[PDB]
Amino acid sequence: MKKVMFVCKRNSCRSQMAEGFAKTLGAGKIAVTSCGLESSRVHPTAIAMMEEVGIDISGQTSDPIENFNADDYDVVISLCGCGVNLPPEWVTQEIFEDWQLEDPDGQSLEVFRTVRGQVKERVENLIAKIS
């Protein structure tokens, strides 16, 4: 099965949140993980703003992207927007993206409840074109 990696900046949760929608809606369509350029984190408000949509991220982890192989991630989605720093093995995939998607970390709960749907439609239209 093809594996989707979601990647973002050091202090971001949108890579972990993108994995949350993708493992819930893409559950029977693809394999999925998430990471960050100098690693990434889960966020308590991204648990509670998303469990009301039936999503889970609480059990997820991260390490710096250069510790991973890229090759076992047939599909790689960045969330930095038309500009990300990546080694060539992380971009040469059969499908690549770099989403123009913000982090709700440190913003209002209305921004969490907005960005969740922006992640959902990005995950959905990405997975629907590959599976």
Q: Find the length of the chain.
A: 131
Experimental technique? NMR
CATH of the domain at 129: 3.40.50.2300
CA distance 8 to 123: 15
Cα separation values, 114 from 3, 37, 120, Å: 27, 25, 10
Q: Residue 14 in 3-state DSSP?
A: helix
- The closest of 57, 94, 98, 88 to 73, measured between CA atoms, is 94
- The closest of 27, 25, 12, 13 to 53, measured between CA atoms, is 25
Residue holding tokens 């991220």?
A: 57
Token readout for 53 is 């949509």
Give me the active site residues, please. Answer: 8, 80
Q: Which domain holds residue 126?
A: 1-131
Domain count, the chain: 1
- Listing DSSP states for 100-113 in one string gives -----TTS-HHHHH
